[PDB]
Symmetry: C3
Subunit: 455 residues, 3 copies
């Protein structure tokens, strides 16, 4: 027969359970081919792509990436696609792994309010991307319309202690990175493959802080990793560890002991990890400006005993992770909501700047503003800042070099410009500094920073 043909379906039809990221449906745990029924519903909706930044996502099952599907090589899959009547657009699905033109696209076209169905046999074992396939295909995929389908080998995968679901995507907003408000899709930036954000699981901090993945020393972790694109190839990397194994789609070839691996646009791989020592392990795109300037990091946090003979050093902090070392940045969300209301208090700006000050500023000036005598001027009880706080907006946007004196000490150094910070971010950071460590006090508005930018 064809390969993957294990005969016709036995027993009762199975209604497939799909999971929201970062979780995975359990092993099918069976020795016979089945008829599997899949209900998947498209929903269009605003969600936070970043703190105080809203985006209209188009989703399979309400999430980016969309719901995870798990079947067995040889299963017969009756695939129903519903387009929720709130949707303004039509949608369909192309599943990689499907043998058939469009991988289902033609038979799955679905207007708002309608349901579609088509049937396919899962001939090919492996991990596979699925995505919308509706003109214009790039826009559907950029708005979040992708996920994974696992087709298990008949004997199933080897048992591990944890299975997780992580999917990278490149996103195209009209506004610049961390510009606040509802951000429309930007076709220009997408055609040019110049994304404003590059994200795991549909948002900045989706898998950092309180939202990290978890395992214990001695446990094995399997991650199903997708690249939804639409455009970027991922230099997919784990910081501080190594993958025991990396297997692309249903490839016969299996790479072992690598830390860095290229994932094509539309590609998917299964990686295996064994926790050897505790701490935060970062998943990134090692096209480093994606990781550190566009949101492309996810954390795996390991619990257990130190092993001083393998690694003597300290847990990850804000020197490396910057503002994502913290549990969350809800203070930024809260301050942004207040601006929209017109009820922005000084305390709102202070708790938001406190969040944003980590790494961004603390790497030189320290957590406590103390600085380092002769090398990094203090921000704590600072005569320099007191003397002219309006110049602090210029110092942040445009930088500072030359000899200067601060609390009667000489500095001849360089503070790089930080023009990438948005007006609200400069304002809140500075309002926190002024209201910390016995400084003058007061406040800096977004409006004040806008004026100084424009000169």
């Amino acid at each position: 027969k064809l390969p993957g043909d294990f005969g016709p379906p036995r027993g009762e039809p199975i209604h497939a359970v799909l999971t929201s990221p970062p979780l995975v449906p359990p092993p099918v745990n069976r020795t016979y081919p089945a008829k599997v029924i899949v209900e998947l519903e498209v929903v269009e909706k605003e969600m936070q792509i970043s703190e105080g930044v809203s985006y209209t996502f188009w989703t399979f099952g309400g999430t980016v990436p969309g719901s995870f599907i798990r079947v067995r090589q040889g299963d017969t899959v009756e695939f129903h696609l519903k387009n929720h009547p709130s949707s303004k657009m039509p949608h369909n699905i192309d599943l990689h792994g499907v043998t058939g033109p469009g991988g289902g696209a033609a038979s799955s076209f679905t207007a708002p309010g309608h349901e579609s169905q088509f049937t396919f046999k899962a001939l090919n074992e492996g991990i596979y991307v699925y995505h919308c396939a509706t003109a214009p295909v790039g826009m559907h995929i950029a708005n979040g319309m992708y996920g994974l389908i696992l087709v298990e080998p008949p004997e199933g995968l080897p048992k591990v202690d944890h299975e997780y679901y992580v999917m990278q995507g490149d996103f195209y907003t009209a506004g610049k990175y961390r510009e606040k408000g509802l951000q429309p899709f930007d076709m220009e930036k997408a055609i040019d493959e110049r994304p404003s954000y590059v994200l795991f699981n549909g948002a900045e901090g989706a898998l950092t802080g309180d939202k990290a993945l978890h395992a214990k020393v001695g446990e094995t972790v399997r991650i199903f990793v997708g690249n939804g694109g639409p455009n970027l190839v991922s230099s997919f990397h784990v910081i501080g560890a190594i993958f025991d194994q990396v297997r692309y789609e249903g490839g016969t070839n299996v790479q072992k002991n690598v830390q860095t691996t290229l994932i094509p646009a539309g590609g998917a791989a299964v990686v295996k990890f064994t926790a050897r020592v505790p701490g935060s392990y970062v998943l990134v795109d090692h096209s480093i400006f994606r990781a550190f300037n566009k949101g492309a990091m996810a954390i795996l946090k390991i619990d257990g005993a130190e092993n001083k003979l393998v690694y003597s050093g300290k847990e990850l902090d804000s020197v490396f992770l910057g503002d994502r070392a913290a549990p969350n940045m809800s203070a930024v969300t809260k301050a942004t909501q207040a601006s929209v209301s017109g009820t922005l208090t000084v305390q709102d700006q202070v708790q938001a700047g406190r969040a944003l000050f980590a790494g961004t500023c603390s790497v030189c000036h320290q957590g406590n503003g103390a600085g380092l005598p002769g090398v990094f001027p203090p921000l704590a009880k600072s005569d320099f800042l007191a003397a002219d706080p309006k110049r602090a907006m210029n110092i942040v946007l445009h930088g500072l070099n030359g000899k200067i004196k601060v609390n009667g000490q000489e500095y001849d150094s360089v503070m790089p410009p930080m023009t990438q910070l948005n007006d609200d971010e400069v304002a809140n950071i500075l309002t926190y500094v002024l209201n910390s460590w016995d400084n003058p006090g007061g406040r800096v508005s977004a409006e004040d920073v806008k004026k100084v930018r424009a000169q």
Copy 2:
């Protein structure tokens, strides 16, 4: 000895036959090393890169990609390169697979009207890119100067039912995608790696519609896939199938059962496919905006019996392929030629818009303009369009949201802007709508759309 040394050439010299894409010279089918003579002639010439879009290609043997060369590991290759006296530039060749500095570049320098020769032994088995190697190398390669050379293993490749030749390239026009006329090379866009088109076999639709590759259910297909670049890496993908095998250059490593595979700039791979069920199978760069916005699709069309137990669904259509589902878009070519002549009739604009309307517009408004009551307003006998057809130019360029009434029915939806359409494309699409389904009639000029763009 060296590896690949099977002794000196036996028998008479063989004059090598080269094929034009997408065809491949036949298997050398011999057990002895030979002296192979290769005559390859460079030609500069305008060809259509897209409908009504002309480009000055620099070519090896009159095609992009250039003529395919097939020899045997151990052969001695006497390589003659002629530069046609019409050429304005000098040219040479670097063949990957050649052991020797420049892979032939120095000894093959050839001014217009001249012939060059150099001899090399084919030590390395595999599939290899060749390209021009003349300062400035990027310009020669961007203008189309690349192809493939197969060096067979001594026992030859395994027999398959079909062998085809597909080569991706990134192209850099002064004008934007589908801007009509003769388009010069743009050095700025090339240096920035921002291509206007991304193409298989030197043009949009080179391998779609009437120009698809063909096989029958049960047949094996081998594709020799090149990436000429100059700059892009291809996330090379088959929609709706799987590659039995992928082998890069003359690599010992062979990947099996993958759908998605990274091809480096200057890389080449051999993929094997087995037809299981009939329909169109799309080859793409799954950096999706290349595939769907810049021309990076090719079709393999399979004939034979449905297998309802493997795949129940319908053949690919314009929901997914958009305007390339059709056999061709000659109507666009014909209307563009008419504009240049100043003899553009209403019928010319109508048949051109009819072509362009598929997917672009039909995905929401339907093939027949009917729309879907309450969800997608009709274009068919439309009071809304009748009431002010000049506003239709604004609706296409800039989009439409809000409550509206069309043939006495309420719509509160969103039609995305389509500013990417060129003036001629908006004009012809709208002229087709006006002259279809009992609408007012009339015509929209490119000149009319230009004015509305500029406001």
Copy 3:
């Protein structure tokens, strides 16, 4: 135990020797695990990124890439990081291959004047990138803060005749490629992944001409290849040869007989080469505009007997390598220093243009300016140039087409524009032509070309 655990350290502590690129520390040549002490010192300093182009590099041990580290799987590594008191910034290190959060980042934070230490066991065999891990991480990496660490298998690597150290990086200057002076870092270009230079070993010509790598026919060469990024993936290619072997990090999978191989951002591979025939072998990023327009070439020069039966052709020259065929371009460095001094002589401009004229101009007009009668007009004793030398600035910046007459011969051809040349480059090239082959003489200033650009 863990894998790589060969017990506790025996014998005396070893003080590790680190080498500057392109050299490599010798094999550890031992059968027991050791305690290895590593002293590495960060230095900030201006160096030439290109002729007459200065950049403030941040370096590990004074070089880009930074000093090479060589230890044995199972060694215990006491890692000391010093930040020289001249530094204006703090720094730390993340080593790929380290089992531990941040791969050392947290425990290695080091202000100007300070020393840090942390200890790790080398559990994982392979070749690994190390880099700075200090907010903002992208800037530290773009300024040159990366190198390699080899962790040998216990039995060591196989013996080869030569081992070399080559590392690619993408660089982001405010000024355009080969714009002269001290060039600041450009955050905009880095975030957009639009590098101005793409370099092996921290500069244009770092490994070309007099600075090429060397081997003899019959010798094996191992290259440790790094991609520091920060952003680019390398289509890493050897022109005119083949890699016997390519192995990524400590991967079990080993590819054999390939010419072209993708290296991820942050990736590293070990390639093996065997010299079969003499000549220059070029290492490139086959994203060709990096190689030929941004500095991404390195040369391996092989000495020994011709083998006419394998390759009949000539050594690489300026048709392919352009201005890098020569031993150096010191004349460009010397002329640029003179402009800064205000002591720029006619002879300074002539020797600088002579350097720059190779490939750029000589590919059509020839080394001697003779041209080719009827095809390429001469520059040698040229009536056309004599008649109006001020028009030569326009011809270079903007090109020339149409019928023309030169030394009483007709030409109807096309000379492409060369607007990419900087004002100083046009001026020096033209001053060389005027003062060569019995031409009028005189000089063209950078200031003259600036005026003609602006019209």
